[PDB]
Amino acid sequence: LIVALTFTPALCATILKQHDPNKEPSNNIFARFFRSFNNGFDRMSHSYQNGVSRMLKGKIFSGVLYAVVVALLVFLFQKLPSSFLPEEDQGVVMTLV
């Protein structure tokens, strides 16, 4: 928190460079990757929004899904056994005779 309040704002003031409203996109293997990634993520966001809308309209379906989720959680909580600490190989063996 403190670092974000003091050190990073100074770093941004000092180290960030002013934006330029000019036709300076250079097509490059290193560069075009980012444009393609941005387009893909932009449409993926639309897909997510559509899924959210269908979730909101379907009250019963969302309710039952969440109920099943909590039920599966509680069912699996029992299945794991419980111990204080794990057993670690420590590279030594003692033998009793």
């Binding site: 670092v3 309040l5 003091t6 050190f7 704002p9 100074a10 770093l11 003031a13 000092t14």
Partner: protein, 49 residues
């Protein structure tokens, strides 16, 4: 306040550097154990007949 250090970048750098130096110095002297717990005392008495 953010404004104070926005105008005094060298000051903010110096504070960051001092923190890092203190931490590096600390790391060169810390104890290293597997667990935070420290075992409670034991006293043993030995006699031979």
């Amino acid at each position: 306040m953010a404004q104070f250090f926005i105008h005094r970048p060298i000051f903010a750098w110096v504070i960051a550097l001092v923190i890092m130096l203190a931490g590096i110095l600390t790391l060169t002297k810390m104890p290293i154990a597997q667990y935070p717990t420290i075992a409670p005392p034991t006293v043993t008495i030995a006699a031979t007949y």
